[PDB]
Amino acid sequence: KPTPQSTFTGPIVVDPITRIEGHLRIMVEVENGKVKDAWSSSQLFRGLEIILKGRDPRDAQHFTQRACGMCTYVHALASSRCVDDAVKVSIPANARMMRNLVMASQYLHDHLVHFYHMHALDWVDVTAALKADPNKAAKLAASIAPARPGNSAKALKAVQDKLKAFVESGQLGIFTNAYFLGGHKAYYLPPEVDLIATAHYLEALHMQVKAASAMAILGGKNPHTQFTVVGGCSNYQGLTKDPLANYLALSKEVCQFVNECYIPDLLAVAGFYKDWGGIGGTSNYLAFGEFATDDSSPEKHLATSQFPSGVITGRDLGKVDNVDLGAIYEDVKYSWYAPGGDGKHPYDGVTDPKYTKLDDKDHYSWMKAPRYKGKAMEVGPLARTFIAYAKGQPDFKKVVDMVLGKLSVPATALHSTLGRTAARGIETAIVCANMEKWIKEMADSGAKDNTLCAKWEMPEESKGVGLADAPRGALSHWIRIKGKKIDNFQLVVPSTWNLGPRGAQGDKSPVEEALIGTPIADPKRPVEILRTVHAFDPCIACGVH
Amino acid sequence: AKHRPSVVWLHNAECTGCTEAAIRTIKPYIDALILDTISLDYQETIMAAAGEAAEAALHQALEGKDGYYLVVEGGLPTIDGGQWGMVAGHPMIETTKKAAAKAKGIICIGTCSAYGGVQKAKPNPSQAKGVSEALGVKTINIPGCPPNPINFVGAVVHVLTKGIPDLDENGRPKLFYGELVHDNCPRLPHFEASEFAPSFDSEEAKKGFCLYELGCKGPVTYNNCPKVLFNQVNWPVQAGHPCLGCSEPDFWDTMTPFYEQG
Ligand code: SF4
Ligand code: SF4
Ligand code: FCO
Ligand code: F3S
Ligand SMILES: [O-][O-]
Ligand SMILES: [Mg+2]
Ligand code: NI
C-alpha cells in the first residue's frame, strides 16, 4: 500500500461501461487523483411501460420479462405478483414455493456470472496468470480454499497453457486493450491468485450452464422463463419426483462450486484489496425482502420474507424501519422525460420521453430517480445483508461474522465497494444453504397435493403491486386496471434505485455518491471506476425499461 | 490457418437475453468456442476493455486485415436521429451501419435484431427497427426471444465452415426453423382429439391437455423447441405454458393477446 492514486485533475468519461447489462455512460470530475463529482448516464430507452398501455393485464409478464434477460424471470415474477394483487388472487402454496425456488436459482446463476464474468476482471490480471508457477499456485489454493482436483498443479498448468496459446496467437478477443495489459498499479494480486481466479472463471462458464438448467426444470427455459400464470404456475411436472431430483442434483453441483470457488475467491481477493473497504460507501438501504413463507399479499411478502424487508437510513443498524410503499416516488428532473413528472408515486407514474443532448448536466439519463421520503436508497445484496444482519437473521449473522473475522474488519467496513462485492457472495452462500430445505418442502407438498394455480376473475377496475427482491434488489411493478385493460403500468427497478440520476433536490444517486472519493491510479485506465460501478451489478435495460 | 475467424458482436436495443442464451451453448461450450473456434473481438457484456479502450478494440476489429463476421443483438431505435440508443456517444444505428458495411456476413441473434422485437411493439415510442429494415441488407436471422443457443452457434459454425445456410422467407435457417413447433408437440394427439385445457387450474391442465384454447401459438410458429428443448431439460409447453410465438416477426403484436386465439 497505500492505495495508488495519481495527481490527475480533469474529466473522465467511460462509455461504454462494459461487463454490465445495457448501456451506461459514467462521467466524473477528478481532482488530484480522486473523483470529486459523478454522473450516471443511461444511454438506451425502449419504453415498455408505454408499450403496455391498453393491453391485456395477462400479457404484462411476457412484455416486462424482456426488460432484462440477465435478471431473466424476475420481471415475470413481479408482474405476476402485481396482477395477482390487482385481481386479488392468493396463489396456492406450491405456486409460492415454485416461484420462490426459481428466484433462488436465479440468484445462484446471476451472482456466479456477475462475480466471475463481469466483476473479476477489475481485480484479476489475467495476463499475469502466465507468470505464475502452477506448483506455487496449487499450494496457495490449498491455503485459501477447500481441496478440489480443479485446483491441482496439473489442472492449473492446463489452464495456463490454454491461456498462453491464446495470448501467443495475437488474437486477444475479449482481453484486447484490457486495463491490466502491461501491468497496472491498481491490480494487486499475486500471479498465483490470478491463475487461480482465471481457472475458476473458465469453470464458472461451464457451471452457469448447469445453474441455468436447474432453473429451466421449473421455469420451462432459460433465458426467459415460461411457467408463471395469473393465480400461480402452469408447470405441474415441476412438482414431480424425477425433475425435482434432477433439480436438486444440479443445484448441489452449483452450490459446491459457490463454496469451493466463489466465496474462497471472493475472500482471497477481498483480503488483497482491504483498502476498498474505505471506498464507495453509501448510507441508506432498502429491501422488499424475498423468499416469503406467505405471499398472499404485498404486506405478507414484506413481513414474512426470509431475507427480510426493511429500511436503513444513515448507516443506523439499530433502526430498521418497515417499508412504506406509499413513500416511494420517482423524480425526472435530471432525466430524459418531459417537465412536470417529479414526485410521482408509481401508481401515478408517468413515462413521457424527452431527450435533450449528451452530457447535458440538467438531463443526463434515461433512468428515473426513485426516492424514498426524499432519500436515495441503495438496494441489492448489501442492502439485504445489512437489513438481515441488523434484524439478527441467523444465517446472515453467522456468514457476515465469518467474513468480518476472516478479513479482520468491523461491520462498518461493509459500507463500501468491498462490502457490496462481499455481500453478493454472502447471500449466494445463504441461498445455497437453503436450497435442499426449500426443494424438500415443495417435493413433499406437491406429492400430497399438486394444486398450482388458483381461480380468479378479471376486475373491471383495480390496482396492484408486485414486489420482489431480485438479485440486484428491491423490484416493484405497479398496475392500474381500467376497463379490464392496462391503464397504467410502471416498473421501479433495482438499477433505477442504484444507478438513476439525481433526484428533484439535485441529490446524487447511490452509484453517483459511491463514486465520490474514488482514487484514480491511472486516468488512461480507470479500473477503480469500474470496480465501484460493477459492484452495484448494473442493469441498464432493467433500470430504464 | 491458425487464425481464428473474427467476430464482432454489437448490442443495440436489447435485453441481453440473447447474449445469455448464446453462453448456454454446450456444443461447444462458450470457452471452447472463443478459445478454439472464433475470435470474439468485441462483446460489451464480457469484454475486459471499457470506454475508449473498448471503442479502440471495436475499431481494431473492424479494420482487421482478415475481415470479420458481424453478430447483431437488439433492434435499432431510429427516433431523433438514433439518439435514444447510443454507445460511446454515437447512435447505435450509425455504428451498426458502419460495422455492417464491410462485414463478411451478418447474423441477427434474436427477434429484436431480426425483426425489431419488444421495443418495436405498438406504439413503438423509439421508432425501433430490425437490422435488415434499418440497414437495407439481407441478414441471417436467428429469432426467438431468445433463440436456442443450438440455433445460433449452429448458424455461426455453419457460416464459418460451410457458408450461408438455406434461409426461409423470413431469413431463418431451415435447419432450425423449417418446422412448426406444433408439428413436434407431444400434446398434438390432444389437439387432434379436441382435448383442450380450459384454464390453468383445470384437471385438463393437470392431465397435460393441449393448450390451444389458452392461446398456444405453436400452430403458427416455426422453431425447434420441442425437438431440441432448452437447457437440455425443458420447453414452455412441457412446463404447461402456451407457446407465445416468440420466433415470429412482430409477435408482440401479431400473437397477442397471448392467452387467447382471438
Ligand atoms: S430477442 Fe428477446 S431475449 Fe433477445 S434481446 Fe430481444 S427481448 Fe432480449
Ligand atoms: S400445446 Fe400448442 S403446440 Fe402443442 S398441440 Fe396444443 S396447440 Fe399445438
Ligand atoms: N436483479 C435484477 Fe434486474 C435490475 N436492476 C431487475 O429487476
Ligand atoms: S414461445 Fe418461443 S421459445 Fe419456442 S415454445 Fe414458443 S417459440
Ligand atoms: O439484472 O437486472
Ligand atoms: Mg419505470
Ligand atoms: Ni436485469
Side-chain angles (χ1 to χ4, degrees), chain A residues 424-460:
Chain A
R424 184 165 297 106
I426 286 166
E427 69 175 21
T428 307
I430 294 167
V431 170
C432 268
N434 282 262
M435 290 301 290
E436 188 163 350
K437 179 180 65 181
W438 290 336
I439 289 164
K440 188 174 153 38
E441 184 198 6
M442 193 172 81
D444 287 354
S445 179
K448 284 172 85 171
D449 184 83
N450 82 156
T451 301
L452 201 47
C453 187
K455 279 164 150 205
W456 61 277
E457 292 193 68
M458 181 67 67
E460 177 68 27

mmCIF file of all heavy atoms in Angstrom, chain A residues 424-460:
data_model
loop_
_atom_site.group_PDB
_atom_site.id
_atom_site.type_symbol
_atom_site.label_atom_id
_atom_site.label_comp_id
_atom_site.label_asym_id
_atom_site.label_seq_id
_atom_site.Cartn_x
_atom_site.Cartn_y
_atom_site.Cartn_z
ATOM 1 N N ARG A 424 -22.740 -9.833 -1.954
ATOM 2 C CA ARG A 424 -23.253 -10.666 -3.068
ATOM 3 C C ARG A 424 -22.910 -12.166 -2.884
ATOM 4 O O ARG A 424 -23.775 -13.037 -3.053
ATOM 5 C CB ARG A 424 -22.762 -10.122 -4.421
ATOM 6 C CG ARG A 424 -23.298 -10.827 -5.665
ATOM 7 C CD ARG A 424 -23.047 -9.991 -6.950
ATOM 8 N NE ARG A 424 -23.781 -8.724 -6.880
ATOM 9 C CZ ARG A 424 -23.242 -7.525 -6.664
ATOM 10 N NH1 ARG A 424 -21.932 -7.378 -6.537
ATOM 11 N NH2 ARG A 424 -24.029 -6.463 -6.575
ATOM 12 N N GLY A 425 -21.667 -12.450 -2.500
ATOM 13 C CA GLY A 425 -21.270 -13.798 -2.132
ATOM 14 C C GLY A 425 -21.923 -14.307 -0.853
ATOM 15 O O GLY A 425 -22.363 -15.464 -0.783
ATOM 16 N N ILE A 426 -21.973 -13.461 0.177
ATOM 17 C CA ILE A 426 -22.628 -13.814 1.431
ATOM 18 C C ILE A 426 -24.028 -14.374 1.149
ATOM 19 O O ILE A 426 -24.329 -15.497 1.550
ATOM 20 C CB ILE A 426 -22.677 -12.609 2.414
ATOM 21 C CG1 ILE A 426 -21.282 -12.357 2.996
ATOM 22 C CG2 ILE A 426 -23.701 -12.836 3.560
ATOM 23 C CD1 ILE A 426 -21.131 -11.023 3.692
ATOM 24 N N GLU A 427 -24.867 -13.628 0.431
ATOM 25 C CA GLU A 427 -26.221 -14.110 0.178
ATOM 26 C C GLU A 427 -26.301 -15.346 -0.725
ATOM 27 O O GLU A 427 -27.214 -16.171 -0.558
ATOM 28 C CB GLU A 427 -27.166 -12.995 -0.274
ATOM 29 C CG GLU A 427 -26.909 -12.425 -1.645
ATOM 30 C CD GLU A 427 -27.985 -11.408 -2.062
ATOM 31 O OE1 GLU A 427 -28.676 -10.853 -1.166
ATOM 32 O OE2 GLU A 427 -28.135 -11.183 -3.288
ATOM 33 N N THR A 428 -25.339 -15.485 -1.648
ATOM 34 C CA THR A 428 -25.269 -16.641 -2.539
ATOM 35 C C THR A 428 -25.078 -17.900 -1.721
ATOM 36 O O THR A 428 -25.738 -18.922 -1.964
ATOM 37 C CB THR A 428 -24.132 -16.516 -3.620
ATOM 38 O OG1 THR A 428 -24.255 -15.282 -4.333
ATOM 39 C CG2 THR A 428 -24.205 -17.660 -4.651
ATOM 40 N N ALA A 429 -24.182 -17.813 -0.736
ATOM 41 C CA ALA A 429 -23.913 -18.914 0.176
ATOM 42 C C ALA A 429 -25.157 -19.274 1.002
ATOM 43 O O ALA A 429 -25.381 -20.437 1.364
ATOM 44 C CB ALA A 429 -22.718 -18.559 1.098
ATOM 45 N N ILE A 430 -25.961 -18.273 1.323
ATOM 46 C CA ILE A 430 -27.140 -18.498 2.165
ATOM 47 C C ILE A 430 -28.297 -19.094 1.351
ATOM 48 O O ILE A 430 -28.958 -20.033 1.800
ATOM 49 C CB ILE A 430 -27.550 -17.227 2.901
ATOM 50 C CG1 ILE A 430 -26.452 -16.846 3.891
ATOM 51 C CG2 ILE A 430 -28.896 -17.394 3.603
ATOM 52 C CD1 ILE A 430 -26.595 -15.442 4.459
ATOM 53 N N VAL A 431 -28.536 -18.565 0.155
ATOM 54 C CA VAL A 431 -29.416 -19.254 -0.780
ATOM 55 C C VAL A 431 -28.983 -20.733 -0.866
ATOM 56 O O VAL A 431 -29.787 -21.642 -0.680
ATOM 57 C CB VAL A 431 -29.416 -18.580 -2.183
ATOM 58 C CG1 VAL A 431 -30.125 -19.445 -3.201
ATOM 59 C CG2 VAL A 431 -30.074 -17.186 -2.131
ATOM 60 N N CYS A 432 -27.703 -20.975 -1.107
ATOM 61 C CA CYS A 432 -27.216 -22.336 -1.256
ATOM 62 C C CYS A 432 -27.533 -23.186 -0.041
ATOM 63 O O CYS A 432 -27.923 -24.353 -0.174
ATOM 64 C CB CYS A 432 -25.719 -22.349 -1.536
ATOM 65 S SG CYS A 432 -25.395 -22.338 -3.261
ATOM 66 N N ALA A 433 -27.375 -22.611 1.145
ATOM 67 C CA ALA A 433 -27.632 -23.372 2.372
ATOM 68 C C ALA A 433 -29.110 -23.706 2.555
ATOM 69 O O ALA A 433 -29.464 -24.561 3.355
ATOM 70 C CB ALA A 433 -27.090 -22.639 3.592
ATOM 71 N N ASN A 434 -29.969 -23.050 1.796
ATOM 72 C CA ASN A 434 -31.415 -23.184 1.956
ATOM 73 C C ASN A 434 -32.089 -24.022 0.876
ATOM 74 O O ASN A 434 -33.247 -24.413 1.034
ATOM 75 C CB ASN A 434 -32.069 -21.795 1.992
ATOM 76 C CG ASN A 434 -31.906 -21.102 3.342
ATOM 77 O OD1 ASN A 434 -32.808 -21.129 4.168
ATOM 78 N ND2 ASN A 434 -30.746 -20.503 3.578
ATOM 79 N N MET A 435 -31.373 -24.290 -0.216
ATOM 80 C CA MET A 435 -31.949 -24.977 -1.370
ATOM 81 C C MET A 435 -32.595 -26.323 -1.016
ATOM 82 O O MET A 435 -33.768 -26.568 -1.326
ATOM 83 C CB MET A 435 -30.895 -25.160 -2.459
ATOM 84 C CG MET A 435 -30.490 -23.838 -3.156
ATOM 85 S SD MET A 435 -31.875 -22.988 -3.930
ATOM 86 C CE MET A 435 -32.239 -24.087 -5.293
ATOM 87 N N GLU A 436 -31.834 -27.199 -0.372
ATOM 88 C CA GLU A 436 -32.342 -28.534 -0.130
ATOM 89 C C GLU A 436 -33.592 -28.510 0.753
ATOM 90 O O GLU A 436 -34.508 -29.284 0.523
ATOM 91 C CB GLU A 436 -31.276 -29.491 0.432
ATOM 92 C CG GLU A 436 -31.819 -30.922 0.487
ATOM 93 C CD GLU A 436 -30.769 -32.015 0.626
ATOM 94 O OE1 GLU A 436 -29.552 -31.720 0.490
ATOM 95 O OE2 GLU A 436 -31.193 -33.182 0.857
ATOM 96 N N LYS A 437 -33.620 -27.619 1.741
ATOM 97 C CA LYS A 437 -34.804 -27.416 2.583
ATOM 98 C C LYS A 437 -36.030 -27.012 1.759
ATOM 99 O O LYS A 437 -37.087 -27.642 1.849
ATOM 100 C CB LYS A 437 -34.516 -26.362 3.650
ATOM 101 C CG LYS A 437 -35.708 -26.069 4.570
ATOM 102 C CD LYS A 437 -35.415 -25.001 5.641
ATOM 103 C CE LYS A 437 -35.150 -23.630 5.036
ATOM 104 N NZ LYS A 437 -34.844 -22.625 6.105
ATOM 105 N N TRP A 438 -35.866 -25.954 0.969
ATOM 106 C CA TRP A 438 -36.892 -25.448 0.068
ATOM 107 C C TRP A 438 -37.386 -26.479 -0.945
ATOM 108 O O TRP A 438 -38.599 -26.610 -1.166
ATOM 109 C CB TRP A 438 -36.374 -24.209 -0.652
ATOM 110 C CG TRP A 438 -36.241 -23.027 0.259
ATOM 111 C CD1 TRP A 438 -36.915 -22.822 1.429
ATOM 112 C CD2 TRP A 438 -35.425 -21.861 0.052
ATOM 113 N NE1 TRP A 438 -36.552 -21.620 1.978
ATOM 114 C CE2 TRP A 438 -35.637 -21.007 1.158
ATOM 115 C CE3 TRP A 438 -34.528 -21.461 -0.952
ATOM 116 C CZ2 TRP A 438 -34.998 -19.768 1.286
ATOM 117 C CZ3 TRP A 438 -33.867 -20.234 -0.809
ATOM 118 C CH2 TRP A 438 -34.112 -19.406 0.301
ATOM 119 N N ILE A 439 -36.448 -27.217 -1.542
ATOM 120 C CA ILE A 439 -36.785 -28.231 -2.547
ATOM 121 C C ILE A 439 -37.592 -29.350 -1.918
ATOM 122 O O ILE A 439 -38.624 -29.763 -2.456
ATOM 123 C CB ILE A 439 -35.533 -28.796 -3.196
ATOM 124 C CG1 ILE A 439 -34.917 -27.724 -4.102
ATOM 125 C CG2 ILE A 439 -35.853 -30.116 -3.910
ATOM 126 C CD1 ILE A 439 -33.486 -27.999 -4.524
ATOM 127 N N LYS A 440 -37.118 -29.811 -0.760
ATOM 128 C CA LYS A 440 -37.780 -30.840 0.020
ATOM 129 C C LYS A 440 -39.209 -30.449 0.429
ATOM 130 O O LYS A 440 -40.127 -31.286 0.395
ATOM 131 C CB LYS A 440 -36.940 -31.161 1.260
ATOM 132 C CG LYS A 440 -37.441 -32.351 2.055
ATOM 133 C CD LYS A 440 -36.487 -32.703 3.196
ATOM 134 C CE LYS A 440 -37.239 -33.400 4.354
ATOM 135 N NZ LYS A 440 -38.304 -34.354 3.896
ATOM 136 N N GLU A 441 -39.369 -29.183 0.822
ATOM 137 C CA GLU A 441 -40.653 -28.623 1.219
ATOM 138 C C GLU A 441 -41.631 -28.733 0.060
ATOM 139 O O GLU A 441 -42.751 -29.184 0.253
ATOM 140 C CB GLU A 441 -40.496 -27.157 1.640
ATOM 141 C CG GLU A 441 -41.793 -26.510 2.171
ATOM 142 C CD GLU A 441 -41.788 -24.964 2.177
ATOM 143 O OE1 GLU A 441 -40.833 -24.329 1.661
ATOM 144 O OE2 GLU A 441 -42.766 -24.374 2.700
ATOM 145 N N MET A 442 -41.202 -28.329 -1.141
ATOM 146 C CA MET A 442 -42.056 -28.394 -2.324
ATOM 147 C C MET A 442 -42.277 -29.816 -2.825
ATOM 148 O O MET A 442 -43.376 -30.146 -3.268
ATOM 149 C CB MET A 442 -41.514 -27.544 -3.463
ATOM 150 C CG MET A 442 -42.539 -27.347 -4.583
ATOM 151 S SD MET A 442 -41.998 -26.168 -5.825
ATOM 152 C CE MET A 442 -40.935 -27.281 -6.747
ATOM 153 N N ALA A 443 -41.238 -30.645 -2.783
ATOM 154 C CA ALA A 443 -41.401 -32.034 -3.183
ATOM 155 C C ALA A 443 -42.484 -32.673 -2.331
ATOM 156 O O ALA A 443 -43.439 -33.246 -2.860
ATOM 157 C CB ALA A 443 -40.088 -32.798 -3.063
ATOM 158 N N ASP A 444 -42.337 -32.557 -1.012
ATOM 159 C CA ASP A 444 -43.287 -33.137 -0.064
ATOM 160 C C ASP A 444 -44.682 -32.602 -0.328
ATOM 161 O O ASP A 444 -45.656 -33.353 -0.324
ATOM 162 C CB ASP A 444 -42.879 -32.814 1.384
ATOM 163 C CG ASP A 444 -41.660 -33.616 1.865
ATOM 164 O OD1 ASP A 444 -41.185 -34.517 1.130
ATOM 165 O OD2 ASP A 444 -41.177 -33.345 2.995
ATOM 166 N N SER A 445 -44.780 -31.301 -0.561
ATOM 167 C CA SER A 445 -46.078 -30.672 -0.757
ATOM 168 C C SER A 445 -46.765 -31.105 -2.062
ATOM 169 O O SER A 445 -47.938 -31.489 -2.060
ATOM 170 C CB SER A 445 -45.924 -29.162 -0.715
ATOM 171 O OG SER A 445 -47.173 -28.553 -0.922
ATOM 172 N N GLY A 446 -46.033 -31.019 -3.169
ATOM 173 C CA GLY A 446 -46.534 -31.418 -4.471
ATOM 174 C C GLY A 446 -46.929 -32.883 -4.545
ATOM 175 O O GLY A 446 -47.855 -33.236 -5.274
ATOM 176 N N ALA A 447 -46.224 -33.733 -3.796
ATOM 177 C CA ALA A 447 -46.619 -35.138 -3.629
ATOM 178 C C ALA A 447 -47.998 -35.266 -3.001
ATOM 179 O O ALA A 447 -48.805 -36.091 -3.428
ATOM 180 C CB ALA A 447 -45.593 -35.898 -2.800
ATOM 181 N N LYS A 448 -48.261 -34.445 -1.987
ATOM 182 C CA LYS A 448 -49.517 -34.508 -1.243
ATOM 183 C C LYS A 448 -50.648 -33.922 -2.067
ATOM 184 O O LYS A 448 -51.722 -34.506 -2.175
ATOM 185 C CB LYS A 448 -49.398 -33.803 0.119
ATOM 186 C CG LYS A 448 -48.634 -34.621 1.161
ATOM 187 C CD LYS A 448 -48.358 -33.840 2.449
ATOM 188 C CE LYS A 448 -49.529 -33.897 3.424
ATOM 189 N NZ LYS A 448 -49.173 -33.311 4.754
ATOM 190 N N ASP A 449 -50.395 -32.765 -2.663
ATOM 191 C CA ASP A 449 -51.402 -32.110 -3.476
ATOM 192 C C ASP A 449 -50.702 -31.297 -4.532
ATOM 193 O O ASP A 449 -49.843 -30.483 -4.214
ATOM 194 C CB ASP A 449 -52.274 -31.196 -2.611
ATOM 195 C CG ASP A 449 -53.399 -30.573 -3.397
ATOM 196 O OD1 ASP A 449 -54.450 -31.235 -3.563
ATOM 197 O OD2 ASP A 449 -53.210 -29.437 -3.882
ATOM 198 N N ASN A 450 -51.081 -31.497 -5.788
ATOM 199 C CA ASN A 450 -50.413 -30.802 -6.879
ATOM 200 C C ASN A 450 -51.113 -29.532 -7.379
ATOM 201 O O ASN A 450 -50.852 -29.082 -8.497
ATOM 202 C CB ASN A 450 -50.082 -31.775 -8.019
ATOM 203 C CG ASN A 450 -51.261 -32.043 -8.944
ATOM 204 O OD1 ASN A 450 -51.053 -32.411 -10.104
ATOM 205 N ND2 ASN A 450 -52.492 -31.851 -8.454
ATOM 206 N N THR A 451 -51.979 -28.950 -6.546
ATOM 207 C CA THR A 451 -52.580 -27.635 -6.831
ATOM 208 C C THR A 451 -51.498 -26.576 -7.082
ATOM 209 O O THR A 451 -50.585 -26.397 -6.265
ATOM 210 C CB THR A 451 -53.526 -27.193 -5.700
ATOM 211 O OG1 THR A 451 -54.552 -28.164 -5.558
ATOM 212 C CG2 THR A 451 -54.192 -25.870 -5.990
ATOM 213 N N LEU A 452 -51.600 -25.881 -8.210
ATOM 214 C CA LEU A 452 -50.545 -24.958 -8.616
ATOM 215 C C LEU A 452 -51.082 -23.623 -9.063
ATOM 216 O O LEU A 452 -50.343 -22.642 -9.141
ATOM 217 C CB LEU A 452 -49.725 -25.557 -9.752
ATOM 218 C CG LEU A 452 -48.317 -25.039 -10.035
ATOM 219 C CD1 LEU A 452 -47.471 -24.904 -8.743
ATOM 220 C CD2 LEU A 452 -47.637 -25.963 -11.056
ATOM 221 N N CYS A 453 -52.369 -23.577 -9.375
ATOM 222 C CA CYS A 453 -52.953 -22.352 -9.870
ATOM 223 C C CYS A 453 -54.319 -22.104 -9.240
ATOM 224 O O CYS A 453 -55.126 -23.015 -9.143
ATOM 225 C CB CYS A 453 -53.070 -22.416 -11.396
ATOM 226 S SG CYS A 453 -53.597 -20.850 -12.087
ATOM 227 N N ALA A 454 -54.593 -20.874 -8.822
ATOM 228 C CA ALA A 454 -55.894 -20.576 -8.223
ATOM 229 C C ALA A 454 -56.905 -19.989 -9.223
ATOM 230 O O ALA A 454 -56.536 -19.456 -10.281
ATOM 231 C CB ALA A 454 -55.750 -19.679 -6.976
ATOM 232 N N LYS A 455 -58.188 -20.118 -8.901
ATOM 233 C CA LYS A 455 -59.216 -19.496 -9.717
ATOM 234 C C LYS A 455 -59.261 -18.009 -9.417
ATOM 235 O O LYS A 455 -59.014 -17.579 -8.284
ATOM 236 C CB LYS A 455 -60.567 -20.139 -9.459
ATOM 237 C CG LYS A 455 -60.754 -21.431 -10.210
ATOM 238 C CD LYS A 455 -61.937 -22.216 -9.620
ATOM 239 C CE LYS A 455 -62.611 -23.052 -10.681
ATOM 240 N NZ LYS A 455 -64.045 -23.319 -10.315
ATOM 241 N N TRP A 456 -59.560 -17.217 -10.435
ATOM 242 C CA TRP A 456 -59.591 -15.778 -10.265
ATOM 243 C C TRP A 456 -60.495 -15.149 -11.325
ATOM 244 O O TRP A 456 -60.856 -15.796 -12.310
ATOM 245 C CB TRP A 456 -58.170 -15.213 -10.341
ATOM 246 C CG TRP A 456 -57.489 -15.472 -11.678
ATOM 247 C CD1 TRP A 456 -56.830 -16.616 -12.065
ATOM 248 C CD2 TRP A 456 -57.422 -14.576 -12.791
ATOM 249 N NE1 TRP A 456 -56.369 -16.483 -13.347
ATOM 250 C CE2 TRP A 456 -56.709 -15.242 -13.821
ATOM 251 C CE3 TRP A 456 -57.876 -13.272 -13.016
ATOM 252 C CZ2 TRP A 456 -56.433 -14.639 -15.063
ATOM 253 C CZ3 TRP A 456 -57.610 -12.679 -14.256
ATOM 254 C CH2 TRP A 456 -56.890 -13.368 -15.258
ATOM 255 N N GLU A 457 -60.839 -13.883 -11.110
ATOM 256 C CA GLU A 457 -61.696 -13.113 -12.012
ATOM 257 C C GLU A 457 -60.995 -11.816 -12.342
ATOM 258 O O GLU A 457 -60.460 -11.175 -11.448
ATOM 259 C CB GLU A 457 -63.018 -12.735 -11.310
ATOM 260 C CG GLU A 457 -63.980 -13.853 -10.971
ATOM 261 C CD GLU A 457 -65.354 -13.302 -10.589
ATOM 262 O OE1 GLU A 457 -66.041 -12.749 -11.485
ATOM 263 O OE2 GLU A 457 -65.729 -13.398 -9.391
ATOM 264 N N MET A 458 -61.029 -11.413 -13.610
ATOM 265 C CA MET A 458 -60.532 -10.093 -14.008
ATOM 266 C C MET A 458 -61.502 -9.003 -13.588
ATOM 267 O O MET A 458 -62.636 -8.971 -14.058
ATOM 268 C CB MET A 458 -60.332 -10.008 -15.516
ATOM 269 C CG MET A 458 -59.792 -8.652 -16.005
ATOM 270 S SD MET A 458 -58.089 -8.297 -15.462
ATOM 271 C CE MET A 458 -57.166 -9.556 -16.367
ATOM 272 N N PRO A 459 -61.047 -8.079 -12.727
ATOM 273 C CA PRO A 459 -61.934 -6.991 -12.305
ATOM 274 C C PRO A 459 -62.010 -5.906 -13.388
ATOM 275 O O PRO A 459 -61.113 -5.795 -14.237
ATOM 276 C CB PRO A 459 -61.237 -6.466 -11.040
ATOM 277 C CG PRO A 459 -59.745 -6.687 -11.334
ATOM 278 C CD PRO A 459 -59.701 -7.983 -12.110
ATOM 279 N N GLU A 460 -63.079 -5.126 -13.374
ATOM 280 C CA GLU A 460 -63.245 -4.039 -14.321
ATOM 281 C C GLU A 460 -62.196 -2.948 -14.038
ATOM 282 O O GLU A 460 -61.497 -2.461 -14.940
ATOM 283 C CB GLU A 460 -64.693 -3.527 -14.227
ATOM 284 C CG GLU A 460 -65.051 -2.332 -15.107
ATOM 285 C CD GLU A 460 -65.063 -2.635 -16.597
ATOM 286 O OE1 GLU A 460 -65.297 -3.795 -17.003
ATOM 287 O OE2 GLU A 460 -64.846 -1.684 -17.375
#
